Design a protein around this ligand. Structure first.
Ligand SMILES: [K+]
Ligand SMILES: [Mg+2]
Ligand SMILES: [Mg+2]
Ligand SMILES: [Mg+2]
Ligand SMILES: [Mg+2]
Ligand SMILES: [Mg+2]
Ligand SMILES: [Mg+2]
Ligand SMILES: [Mg+2]
Ligand SMILES: [Mg+2]
Ligand SMILES: [Mg+2]
Ligand SMILES: [Mg+2]
Ligand SMILES: [Mg+2]
Ligand SMILES: [Mg+2]
Ligand SMILES: [Mg+2]
Ligand SMILES: [Mg+2]
Ligand SMILES: [Mg+2]
Ligand SMILES: [Mg+2]
Ligand SMILES: [Mg+2]
Ligand SMILES: [Mg+2]
Ligand SMILES: [Mg+2]
Ligand SMILES: [Mg+2]
Ligand SMILES: [Mg+2]
Ligand SMILES: [Mg+2]
Ligand SMILES: [Mg+2]
Ligand SMILES: [Mg+2]
Ligand SMILES: [Mg+2]
Ligand SMILES: [Mg+2]
Ligand SMILES: [Mg+2]
Ligand SMILES: [Mg+2]
Ligand SMILES: [Mg+2]
Ligand SMILES: [Mg+2]
Ligand SMILES: [Mg+2]
Ligand SMILES: [Mg+2]
Ligand SMILES: [Mg+2]
Ligand SMILES: [Mg+2]
Ligand SMILES: [Mg+2]
Ligand SMILES: [Mg+2]
Ligand SMILES: [Mg+2]
Ligand SMILES: [Mg+2]
Ligand SMILES: [Mg+2]
Ligand SMILES: [Mg+2]
Ligand SMILES: [Mg+2]
Ligand SMILES: [Mg+2]
Ligand SMILES: [Mg+2]
Ligand SMILES: [Mg+2]
Ligand SMILES: [Mg+2]
Ligand SMILES: [Mg+2]
Ligand SMILES: [Mg+2]
Ligand SMILES: [Mg+2]
Ligand SMILES: [Mg+2]
Ligand SMILES: [Mg+2]
Ligand SMILES: [Mg+2]
Ligand SMILES: [Mg+2]
Ligand SMILES: [Mg+2]
Ligand SMILES: [Mg+2]
Ligand SMILES: [Mg+2]
Ligand SMILES: [Mg+2]
Ligand SMILES: [Mg+2]
Ligand SMILES: [Mg+2]
Ligand SMILES: [Mg+2]
Ligand SMILES: [Mg+2]
Ligand SMILES: [Mg+2]
Ligand SMILES: [Mg+2]
Ligand SMILES: [Mg+2]
Ligand SMILES: [Mg+2]
Ligand SMILES: [Mg+2]
Ligand SMILES: [Mg+2]
Ligand SMILES: [Mg+2]
Ligand SMILES: [Mg+2]
Ligand SMILES: [Mg+2]
Ligand SMILES: [Mg+2]
Ligand SMILES: [Mg+2]
Ligand SMILES: [Mg+2]
Ligand SMILES: [Mg+2]
Ligand SMILES: [Mg+2]
Ligand SMILES: [Mg+2]
Ligand SMILES: [Mg+2]
Ligand SMILES: [Mg+2]
Ligand SMILES: [Mg+2]
Ligand SMILES: [Mg+2]
Ligand SMILES: [Mg+2]
Ligand SMILES: [Mg+2]
Ligand SMILES: [Mg+2]
Ligand SMILES: [Mg+2]
Ligand SMILES: [Mg+2]
Ligand SMILES: [Mg+2]
Ligand SMILES: [Mg+2]
Ligand SMILES: [Mg+2]
Ligand SMILES: [Mg+2]
Ligand SMILES: [Mg+2]
Ligand SMILES: [Mg+2]
Ligand SMILES: [Mg+2]
Ligand SMILES: [Mg+2]
Ligand SMILES: [Mg+2]
Ligand SMILES: [Mg+2]
Ligand SMILES: [Mg+2]
Ligand SMILES: [Mg+2]
Ligand SMILES: [Mg+2]
Ligand SMILES: [Mg+2]
Ligand SMILES: [Mg+2]
Ligand SMILES: [Mg+2]
Ligand SMILES: [Mg+2]
Ligand SMILES: [Mg+2]
Ligand SMILES: [Mg+2]
Ligand SMILES: [Mg+2]
Ligand SMILES: [Mg+2]
Ligand SMILES: [Mg+2]
Ligand SMILES: [Mg+2]
Ligand SMILES: [Mg+2]
Ligand SMILES: [Mg+2]
Ligand SMILES: [Mg+2]
Ligand SMILES: [Mg+2]
Ligand SMILES: [Mg+2]
Ligand SMILES: [Mg+2]
Ligand SMILES: [Mg+2]
Ligand SMILES: [Mg+2]
Ligand SMILES: [Mg+2]
Ligand SMILES: [Mg+2]
Ligand SMILES: [Mg+2]
Ligand SMILES: [Mg+2]
Ligand SMILES: [Mg+2]
Ligand SMILES: [Mg+2]
Ligand SMILES: [Mg+2]
Ligand SMILES: [Mg+2]
Ligand SMILES: [Mg+2]
Ligand SMILES: [Mg+2]
Ligand SMILES: [Mg+2]
Ligand SMILES: [Mg+2]
Ligand SMILES: [Mg+2]
Ligand SMILES: [Mg+2]
Ligand SMILES: [Mg+2]
Ligand SMILES: [Mg+2]
Ligand SMILES: [Mg+2]
Ligand SMILES: [Mg+2]
Ligand SMILES: [Mg+2]
Ligand SMILES: [Mg+2]
Ligand SMILES: [Mg+2]
Ligand SMILES: [Mg+2]
Ligand SMILES: [Mg+2]
Ligand SMILES: [Mg+2]
Ligand SMILES: [Mg+2]
Ligand SMILES: [Mg+2]
Ligand SMILES: [Mg+2]
Ligand SMILES: [Mg+2]
Ligand SMILES: [Mg+2]
Ligand SMILES: [Mg+2]
Ligand SMILES: [Mg+2]
Ligand SMILES: [Mg+2]
Ligand SMILES: [Mg+2]
Ligand SMILES: [Mg+2]
Ligand SMILES: [Mg+2]
Ligand SMILES: [Mg+2]
Ligand SMILES: [Mg+2]
Ligand SMILES: [Mg+2]
Ligand SMILES: [Mg+2]
Ligand SMILES: [Mg+2]
Ligand SMILES: [Mg+2]
Ligand SMILES: [Mg+2]
Ligand SMILES: [Mg+2]
Ligand SMILES: [Mg+2]
Ligand SMILES: [Mg+2]
Ligand SMILES: [Mg+2]
Ligand SMILES: [Mg+2]
Ligand SMILES: [Mg+2]
Ligand SMILES: [Mg+2]
Ligand SMILES: [Mg+2]
Ligand SMILES: [Mg+2]
Ligand SMILES: [Mg+2]
Ligand SMILES: [Mg+2]
Ligand SMILES: [Mg+2]
Ligand SMILES: [Mg+2]
Ligand SMILES: [Mg+2]
Ligand SMILES: [Mg+2]
Ligand SMILES: [Mg+2]
Ligand SMILES: [Mg+2]
Ligand SMILES: [Mg+2]
Ligand SMILES: [Mg+2]
Ligand SMILES: [Mg+2]
Ligand SMILES: [Mg+2]
Ligand SMILES: [Mg+2]
Ligand SMILES: [Mg+2]
Ligand SMILES: [Mg+2]
Ligand SMILES: [Mg+2]
Ligand SMILES: [Mg+2]
Ligand SMILES: [Mg+2]
Ligand SMILES: [Mg+2]
Ligand SMILES: [Mg+2]
Ligand SMILES: [Mg+2]
Ligand SMILES: [Mg+2]
Ligand SMILES: [Mg+2]
Ligand SMILES: [Mg+2]
Ligand SMILES: [Mg+2]
Ligand SMILES: [Mg+2]
Ligand SMILES: [Mg+2]
Ligand SMILES: [Mg+2]
Ligand SMILES: [Mg+2]
Ligand SMILES: [Mg+2]
Ligand SMILES: [Mg+2]
Ligand SMILES: [Mg+2]
Ligand SMILES: [Mg+2]
Ligand SMILES: [Mg+2]
Ligand SMILES: [Mg+2]
Ligand SMILES: [Mg+2]
Ligand SMILES: [Mg+2]
Ligand SMILES: [Mg+2]
Ligand SMILES: [Mg+2]
Ligand SMILES: [Mg+2]
Ligand SMILES: [Mg+2]
Ligand SMILES: [Mg+2]
Ligand SMILES: [Mg+2]
Ligand SMILES: [Mg+2]
Ligand SMILES: [Mg+2]
Ligand SMILES: [Mg+2]
Ligand SMILES: [Mg+2]
Ligand SMILES: [Mg+2]
Ligand SMILES: [Mg+2]
Ligand SMILES: [Mg+2]
Ligand SMILES: [Mg+2]
Ligand SMILES: [Mg+2]
Ligand SMILES: [Mg+2]
Ligand SMILES: [Mg+2]
Ligand SMILES: [Mg+2]
Ligand SMILES: [Mg+2]
Ligand SMILES: [Mg+2]
Ligand SMILES: [Mg+2]
Ligand SMILES: [Mg+2]
Ligand SMILES: [Mg+2]
Ligand SMILES: [Mg+2]
Ligand SMILES: [Mg+2]
Ligand SMILES: [Mg+2]
Ligand SMILES: [Mg+2]
Ligand SMILES: [Mg+2]
Ligand SMILES: [Mg+2]
Lengths: 275, 48
RNA sequence: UGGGAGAGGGUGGUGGAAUUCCCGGAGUAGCGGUGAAAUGCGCAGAUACCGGGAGGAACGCCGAUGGCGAAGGCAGCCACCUGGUCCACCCGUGACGCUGAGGCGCGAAAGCGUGGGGAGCAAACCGGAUUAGAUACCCGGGUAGUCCACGCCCUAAACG
RNA sequence: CCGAGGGUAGGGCCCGUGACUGGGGCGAAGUCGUAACAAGGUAGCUGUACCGGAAGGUGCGGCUGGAU
RNA sequence: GCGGGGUGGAGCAGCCUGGUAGCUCGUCGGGCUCAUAACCCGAAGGUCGUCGGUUCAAAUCCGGCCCCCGCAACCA
RNA sequence: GAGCUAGCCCUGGCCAGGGUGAAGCUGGGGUGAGACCCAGUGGAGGCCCGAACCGGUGGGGGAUGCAAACCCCUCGGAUGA
RNA sequence: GAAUGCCGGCAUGAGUAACGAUAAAGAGGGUGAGAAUCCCUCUCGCCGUAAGCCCAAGGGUUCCUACGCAAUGGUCGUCAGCGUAGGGUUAGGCGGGACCUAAGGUGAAGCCGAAAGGCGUAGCCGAAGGGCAGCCGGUUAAUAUUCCGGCCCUUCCCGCAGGUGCGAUGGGGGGACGCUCUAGGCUAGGGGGACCGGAGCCAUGGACGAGCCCGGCCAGAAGCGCAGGGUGGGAGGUAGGCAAAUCCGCCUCCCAACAAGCUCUGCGUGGUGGGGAAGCCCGGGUGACAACCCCCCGAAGCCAGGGAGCCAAGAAAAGCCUCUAAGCACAACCUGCGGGAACCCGUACCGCAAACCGACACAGGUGGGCGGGUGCAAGAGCACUCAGGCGCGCGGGAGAACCCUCGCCAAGGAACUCUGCAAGUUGGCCCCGUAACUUCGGGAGAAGGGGUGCUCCCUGGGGUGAUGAGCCCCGGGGAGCCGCAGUGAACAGGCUCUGGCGACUGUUUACCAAAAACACAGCUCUCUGCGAACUCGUAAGAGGAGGUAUAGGGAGCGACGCUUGCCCGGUGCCGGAAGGUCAAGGGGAGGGGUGCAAGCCCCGAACCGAAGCCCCGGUGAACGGCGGCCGUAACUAUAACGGUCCUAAGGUAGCGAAAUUCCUUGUCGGGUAAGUUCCGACCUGCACGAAAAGCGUAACGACCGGAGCGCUGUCUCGGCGAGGGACCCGGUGAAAUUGAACUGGCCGUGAAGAUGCGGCCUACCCGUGGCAGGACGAAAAGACCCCGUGGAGCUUUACUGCAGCC
RNA sequence: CGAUGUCGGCUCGUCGCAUCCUGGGGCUGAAGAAGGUCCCAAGGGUUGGGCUGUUCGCCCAUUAAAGCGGCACGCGAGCUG
């Protein structure tokens, strides 16, 4: 759900926060966390390469297991469901019977106390990982490797999912969260179910301060600037665009397709996305 | 008001110091020039 | 106590027909539409035909002048949860009844909020026709919406 | 002490009136179209929604107080 | 101060490229109708804002006057 | 050249005192159950008043200045972007 | 002889301005050639959340003493942060290093780049973070957690003893964490005492008193006590913690579990060692055998890795403990005791300032800790005051104008002015009371009022104690007294009505603009399938992101409400294997040069040949655009209606003389005695209009309008008074400016505004305080305007290139 | 153009007279009163307020009257802005 507030301040009026209901543990595993190095959007040259970033709350990086084919046939129990500040999804703590402890992103309906497992022979159940070829066509799925053994790349965001549409050769057909239809190799792993915390998108930051907490510094419009800065810069009083709407770097920002046409993965994309 | 010169012993040494000059092509040229001009000090005086 | 009929209600699941779109094949000079046409679609290969896929919505025959519900309303099929109701036997309680100003709940369609969905249909809107005109009726398009979830609205030729 | 009342400040109800504005009623022979009554020349009415000089039109569902 | 315009009654062609004034509506006569509109058949009306010039010839090309709408009128 | 200034990164520090009284929780009422209402507890917030601190609104002074931006009065923020 | 020339020297302004916070001085006595200025005393004033104290930067001998006063010091100087000289800084425990890691920097391996160089995992460096063993007093002219004294502790090496499978840069644990609020118990600190110690004291009417005045502690191992922190124990299995592991993780089993036990800190006590006031005698002596006790207040500090709640989810690594691996088990390690060993650097002094940053002994700037008492509701606010520190390095007079800063003002009360600018008024707490509207929070301190001191009497609840006394903290009810006035001083909102704009808190032009601008949550479009897009880079490599379409980039709009119409012809972006054009290249009909020839060599048509452009579609919260003339109703007027030209389509809802309206002070209404502004209306909108959003909107605003109340020196209209200057005397002594000057008025003339020319008039010589009309006064080679085939920033469908992309 | 500060207000005046008022007249379509118009006359006088940055103008309430111009559209080394 989403938590509301009474308007006892102007900002408190619209501000909403996550309910955190599924969260069962409020500090992480000491052995699964490492310090996150904040960049501020600066590269090794020390230059801002991504504008408007910095000043957010300090975070620890929780190591996440994006392989899972790492421990085939070795069942694990769900010890807890925890808060991960580095991603929109909630994360689940797995105590393997091995005694090894790992983190996965927590699928919807996943409950603490249940058993999960990974492998070709695994049941088709929420939280289990199988290579895509062994998953029944038409089941919803998340955390999908794009290529075999290369790590789970697709559908990791809160609420997101990908669905298996059918099979063709060594490949399967997925409908990505975005609506693109794509061939993904059959040996690629995927966890069944959809990523949890689906109410994530209904959160209303409510005030400028909240953006600042997330490390999002204020974004200044092109039209608010001067010609030295931006194509939409300058003008006496307010001005319209007066040219095709453009980025600070001059390229067109309404409609211009930007992916490389000759990209090798084109052979594997059946249909460009959705809405 | 707060003025521009705010002395700092570490800052000075690390910025204009001898070892700072020698590390870089531009810094070695400074030392060479100041040696050639016959400067008594090649680098700012800072007490550490 | 024992039985029966039913689209009464809610949840989950699932079946085939049809339309649209996409893919492959085969094939060529028109298709579509009307009162008649025009817009539209079509040699950049359409319509008509066969194969493959995706998706939404509605359930043909049974089907009735029939059935259920207090009313609005309720129709593929399956399972679960649940309401009302009729009959029987003449067993229990002993008038515990009727109605009901306020209150509470329910309440077709349209409409509104948040999110999803979107094949067909279609306000608005555009175009073609008709016409003196045609902000219409007819035709080709088409956005909300029609569908789902939750929350509102609380109206009706809500009629027997 | 209470006390008519006077003063100050803020409220409540009512009446009169007001540039302008909104529709309503009425008015012997104005202008525009022709929605309804005959299948009224698109059956009508309807709750709502949207649109249009105007009657009205259309969408969705309903009713027969319609078909002959 | 610079641009475009004035032509049957109304609204617009022709001017550029000199000779030949055209389209819709309106008006007038006749029809259909019980009657009117719609509709059908036919017909009339401009000498082109004016004056002046060029030309064999001027709505048409060039000058001036009347008029008509526009655009401009900035730095102090 | 970022010992001024602008942003970010790492690691520390600071914010007198008073005021308002969200959610929740507890009890009570209510109902088939609910929603919900009442009191108590509670201590939220780019919440309020106001020092430090950070500012720099209006006015006066200063104008070869105390000062190449200062002084007085007044005024903004002050748990937060 | 001129270049606002260059360098220097010396003038003028001028004995003029000034001598740097208005906290403030006076006298006596010293010293000395000389004294307002140095020393001493007494009196007076000033700071006291500092103008006192400690520390860190930075400064670098400025420290202490003697001897000096030319210069430095805004005056003086015998004095000094000045001159000369001599002296002064002492550590195993304080800080840093022989320890650890953070960003970052560096960088074996590796990658990249014409060269220089750029990257880069580990590793190394890097602290005000982690970690680590000293507290109290005495002493010097000057240092002290450093020397000394008392008490206490750390590591290293070696030895002795007891114990154990010992052994690590490897494994594991731990270290190890946020914000707000907060419990218990302490301590720091402070208040009081009729109690304990103490020189003395009785004044001027009274007091020999339960009188006054002064003080009543600090450190301390083991042990003990009080309060807290941390931590389960045994067994069986074990495939995970890149080898191993008895450790850790996982499973199972018995026992106990806001306990206890073990451990670890804080406070208390504690053998012992210290300290020890006023007062009057000359820093010291005495006081003094000083006493060293009880009660209350009480931290933000300590127990501390405590507790709770919340979302934005809160370093690393070593020390430390445990596991084992080579090894090795005459070794090794742990434990206790003992002797020995323990290095390098800083240590003076200033440190909110005369020693740092500002050229100055500069009213400015500078991080951390302590910061006492009383009263005012609290407090770091305010007033006074302790300890401590000062009177700000020119003075003495006088009592003008004028200036500044301040106080009061009769009657009036905004009549002032662009404007209530400025200054009044209001002003804390307690109680009563409080409107429209609203998003139900608010608007609210709305508005408006009443109370406020002191004395006596009665009484209620809490804290410490004990349940009582005492002390302390919240209260309530009677009866009184005084004054002009009781938050009696100081600190401390004027209020309301109504518009515009921006939702809001924020942000900005350092140093003329704080706003209506920027930002903002929120809305929409668009790109991006991940080796993402996009950004920096030649590249490597980064950021994006250890993120994955509920994510990330770009763009516009700007909470919220109700909405956001028509135009796709032009430009853009998107789709479109047809067709046209289209470069290198392919092809080579057909020609040419040369040669005796084979041959060499050079042109070369049709045809095949990408992107792009053309062409066919789509698309507006993409760039953008959203008509004209003529006629018409049974009074007039107007035109629902109509005709016709044109368009890609002719501006919809809503709004409108507007932050937009030219005419214009439109017209009408409201408010005013009077309203170019204001509010409400109308609509021929010169020239609104729907995300360069349209119309509204509770709350907010040092934003800009209009009005009223209150109150006023703003004003009629000025007066008086205060202090700092101005004035005079002693000291010190600038400045821009300056062709030279023996520098009057008028009317003329003159390059057209004359002290300087002509005519006339007036005028003895030289100053001082004053005022600003002139010297086209000073300042700045006009910043407007033009000119220069001068420059720079910015734009584009100007030209021509380039990166980038195709 | 190696700088002559530029509207209006405020303050402070001074001057011209083509005179607003006051004083002296002639003519009148001058009965009186009150006016019209012209002449002489610059000595003195020539108000307070609403609106606007305003000059000006309009308006309110008065008045003997509410004059018009010059002085670098007088006056920023006098002030305002
Ligand atoms: K100009
Ligand atoms: Mg809320
Ligand atoms: Mg959750
Ligand atoms: Mg770790
Ligand atoms: Mg780097
Ligand atoms: Mg770098
Ligand atoms: Mg960026
Ligand atoms: Mg950034
Ligand atoms: Mg999460
Ligand atoms: Mg954050
Ligand atoms: Mg922005
Ligand atoms: Mg700008
Ligand atoms: Mg730049
Ligand atoms: Mg740049
Ligand atoms: Mg540009
Ligand atoms: Mg622009
Ligand atoms: Mg602009
Ligand atoms: Mg503009
Ligand atoms: Mg523009
Ligand atoms: Mg444009
Ligand atoms: Mg552009
Ligand atoms: Mg690009
Ligand atoms: Mg795609
Ligand atoms: Mg600094
Ligand atoms: Mg330093
Ligand atoms: Mg340093
Ligand atoms: Mg430094
Ligand atoms: Mg260096
Ligand atoms: Mg030198
Ligand atoms: Mg030398
Ligand atoms: Mg150097
Ligand atoms: Mg073909
Ligand atoms: Mg019976
Ligand atoms: Mg009943
Ligand atoms: Mg309903
Ligand atoms: Mg419905
Ligand atoms: Mg509705
Ligand atoms: Mg007809
Ligand atoms: Mg028509
Ligand atoms: Mg609907
Ligand atoms: Mg019926
Ligand atoms: Mg009376
Ligand atoms: Mg009809
Ligand atoms: Mg009809
Ligand atoms: Mg009809
Ligand atoms: Mg009909
Ligand atoms: Mg119309
Ligand atoms: Mg319609
Ligand atoms: Mg219907
Ligand atoms: Mg009928
Ligand atoms: Mg022509
Ligand atoms: Mg021609
Ligand atoms: Mg008849
Ligand atoms: Mg007819
Ligand atoms: Mg001729
Ligand atoms: Mg002729
Ligand atoms: Mg002719
Ligand atoms: Mg011709
Ligand atoms: Mg002609
Ligand atoms: Mg210009
Ligand atoms: Mg900096
Ligand atoms: Mg710095
Ligand atoms: Mg604070
Ligand atoms: Mg506080
Ligand atoms: Mg309470
Ligand atoms: Mg609070
Ligand atoms: Mg606040
Ligand atoms: Mg505030
Ligand atoms: Mg100021
Ligand atoms: Mg400042
Ligand atoms: Mg003021
Ligand atoms: Mg200045
Ligand atoms: Mg100041
Ligand atoms: Mg303030
Ligand atoms: Mg204030
Ligand atoms: Mg405040
Ligand atoms: Mg505070
Ligand atoms: Mg913060
Ligand atoms: Mg010469
Ligand atoms: Mg000079
Ligand atoms: Mg001389
Ligand atoms: Mg001189
Ligand atoms: Mg002199
Ligand atoms: Mg003198
Ligand atoms: Mg002088
Ligand atoms: Mg003088
Ligand atoms: Mg001076
Ligand atoms: Mg001074
Ligand atoms: Mg002084
Ligand atoms: Mg004296
Ligand atoms: Mg002296
Ligand atoms: Mg002397
Ligand atoms: Mg003195
Ligand atoms: Mg002395
Ligand atoms: Mg004090
Ligand atoms: Mg120095
Ligand atoms: Mg001297
Ligand atoms: Mg001397
Ligand atoms: Mg001297
Ligand atoms: Mg001197
Ligand atoms: Mg001297
Ligand atoms: Mg000085
Ligand atoms: Mg001497
Ligand atoms: Mg010394
Ligand atoms: Mg020692
Ligand atoms: Mg060593
Ligand atoms: Mg290290
Ligand atoms: Mg490097
Ligand atoms: Mg380093
Ligand atoms: Mg180091
Ligand atoms: Mg350190
Ligand atoms: Mg240490
Ligand atoms: Mg110690
Ligand atoms: Mg000594
Ligand atoms: Mg052992
Ligand atoms: Mg061992
Ligand atoms: Mg941690
Ligand atoms: Mg830390
Ligand atoms: Mg103590
Ligand atoms: Mg006390
Ligand atoms: Mg094992
Ligand atoms: Mg192992
Ligand atoms: Mg074992
Ligand atoms: Mg003794
Ligand atoms: Mg804690
Ligand atoms: Mg929080
Ligand atoms: Mg690390
Ligand atoms: Mg071995
Ligand atoms: Mg051995
Ligand atoms: Mg050594
Ligand atoms: Mg020392
Ligand atoms: Mg300080
Ligand atoms: Mg000092
Ligand atoms: Mg400087
Ligand atoms: Mg001084
Ligand atoms: Mg100073
Ligand atoms: Mg107080
Ligand atoms: Mg003084
Ligand atoms: Mg005098
Ligand atoms: Mg007065
Ligand atoms: Mg008044
Ligand atoms: Mg009054
Ligand atoms: Mg006023
Ligand atoms: Mg005002
Ligand atoms: Mg006052
Ligand atoms: Mg309310
Ligand atoms: Mg009040
Ligand atoms: Mg008294
Ligand atoms: Mg006060
Ligand atoms: Mg206040
Ligand atoms: Mg207005
Ligand atoms: Mg703003
Ligand atoms: Mg604002
Ligand atoms: Mg706005
Ligand atoms: Mg708003
Ligand atoms: Mg704030
Ligand atoms: Mg700004
Ligand atoms: Mg500024
Ligand atoms: Mg500036
Ligand atoms: Mg500046
Ligand atoms: Mg500036
Ligand atoms: Mg200013
Ligand atoms: Mg402001
Ligand atoms: Mg929105
Ligand atoms: Mg680049
Ligand atoms: Mg990364
Ligand atoms: Mg991402
Ligand atoms: Mg906003
Ligand atoms: Mg903005
Ligand atoms: Mg904007
Ligand atoms: Mg278009
Ligand atoms: Mg198009
Ligand atoms: Mg287009
Ligand atoms: Mg294209
Ligand atoms: Mg092509
Ligand atoms: Mg008429
Ligand atoms: Mg429209
Ligand atoms: Mg208007
Ligand atoms: Mg405006
Ligand atoms: Mg306008
Ligand atoms: Mg106007
Ligand atoms: Mg105007
Ligand atoms: Mg007017
Ligand atoms: Mg108005
Ligand atoms: Mg009008
Ligand atoms: Mg725009
Ligand atoms: Mg727009
Ligand atoms: Mg508005
Ligand atoms: Mg508003
Ligand atoms: Mg509202
Ligand atoms: Mg408002
Ligand atoms: Mg504001
Ligand atoms: Mg403001
Ligand atoms: Mg005065
Ligand atoms: Mg005086
Ligand atoms: Mg001197
Ligand atoms: Mg001369
Ligand atoms: Mg001379
Ligand atoms: Mg002349
Ligand atoms: Mg002259
Ligand atoms: Mg003369
Ligand atoms: Mg002469
Ligand atoms: Mg002469
Ligand atoms: Mg003469
Ligand atoms: Mg004369
Ligand atoms: Mg003068
Ligand atoms: Mg003067
Ligand atoms: Mg002058
Ligand atoms: Mg100057
Ligand atoms: Mg020059
Ligand atoms: Mg010049
Ligand atoms: Mg200049
Ligand atoms: Mg010029
Ligand atoms: Mg040229
Ligand atoms: Mg030239
Ligand atoms: Mg040039
Ligand atoms: Mg240029
Ligand atoms: Mg000039
Ligand atoms: Mg000059
Ligand atoms: Mg000059
Ligand atoms: Mg007279
Ligand atoms: Mg008379
Ligand atoms: Mg006169
Ligand atoms: Mg005026
Ligand atoms: Mg005017
Ligand atoms: Mg002038
Ligand atoms: Mg003039
Ligand atoms: Mg003037
Ligand atoms: Mg001035
Ligand atoms: Mg002026
Ligand atoms: Mg002037
Ligand atoms: Mg001047
Ligand atoms: Mg002058």
């Amino acid at each position: 759900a989403v938590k509301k507030f009474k308007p006892y301040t102007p900002s408190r009026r619209f501000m909403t926060v996550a309910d955190f209901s599924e969260i069962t543990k409020t500090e992480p595993e000491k052995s699964l966390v490492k310090p996150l190095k904040k960049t501020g959007g600066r590269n090794n040259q020390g230059r801002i390469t991504v504008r408007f970033r910095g000043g957010g709350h300090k975070r620890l990086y929780r190591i996440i297991d994006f392989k899972r084919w790492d421990k085939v046939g070795i069942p694990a129990k769900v010890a807890a469901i925890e808060y991960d500040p580095n991603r929109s999804a909630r994360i689940a703590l797995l105590h393997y019977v091995d005694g090894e402890k790992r983190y996965i992103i927590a699928p919807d309906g996943l409950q603490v106390g249940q058993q999960v497992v990974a492998g070709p022979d695994a049941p088709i159940q929420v939280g289990n990982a199988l290579p895509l070829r062994f998953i029944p066509v038409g089941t919803v799925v998340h955390a999908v490797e794009l290529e075999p053994k290369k790590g789970a790349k697709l559908a990791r965001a809160a609420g997101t999912s990908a669905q298996i549409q059918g099979r063709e050769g060594d490949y399967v057909i997925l409908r990505l969260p975005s609506g693109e239809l794509r061939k993904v190799h059959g040996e690629c792993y995927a966890t069944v179910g959809a990523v949890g915390n689906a109410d994530h998108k209904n959160i209303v930051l409510g005030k400028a301060g909240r953006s600042r907490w997330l490390g999002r510094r204020p974004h200044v419009r092109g039209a608010a600037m001067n010609p030295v800065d931006h194509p939409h810069g300058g003008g006496e009083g307010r001005a319209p665009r007066g040219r095709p709407p453009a980025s600070p770097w001059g390229w067109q920002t309404k409609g211009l397709k930007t992916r490389k046409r000759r990209k090798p993965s084109s052979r594997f994309i059946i249909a460009r996305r959705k809405k | 008001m707060k003025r521009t010169w705010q002395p700092n012993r570490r800052k000075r040494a690390k910025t204009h110091g001898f070892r700072a000059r020698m590390r870089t092509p531009g810094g070695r040229k400074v030392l060479k020039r100041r040696r050639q001009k016959g400067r008594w000090r090649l680098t700012p005086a800072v007490r550490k």
